[PDB]
């Protein structure tokens, strides 16, 4: 038995996937300015704010 005169399936093969990036460096300094373990900055003006 069937319940539809017309039936259509649609499947999406466009799933994005996580990737690694070989750009961002890290510097492991000594301080107590912020509680978390890592902070990202785009300019020194941001660092001076913290």
């Amino acid at each position: 038995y069937q319940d539809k005169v017309v039936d259509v399936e649609v499947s999406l093969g466009t799933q994005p996937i996580d990737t690694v990036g070989f750009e961002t460096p890290m510097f492991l300094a000594m301080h107590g300015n912020f509680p978390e373990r890592i902070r990202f900055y785009v300019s020194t003006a941001g660092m001076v704010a913290d």
Binding site: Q15, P16, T19
Partner: protein
């Protein structure tokens, strides 16, 4: 890249126009020509 919608490899080339700073000239005086 299509999935993430990111285009990367655009490239461009330019030729800057250098101004002139110094000049050197060679002159000569002759009486005739073969």
């Amino acid at each position: 890249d299509l999935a993430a919608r990111i285009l990367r490899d655009v490239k461009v080339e330019l030729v800057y126009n250098n101004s002139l700073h110094y000049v050197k000239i060679r002159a000569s005086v002759v009486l005739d020509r073969p």
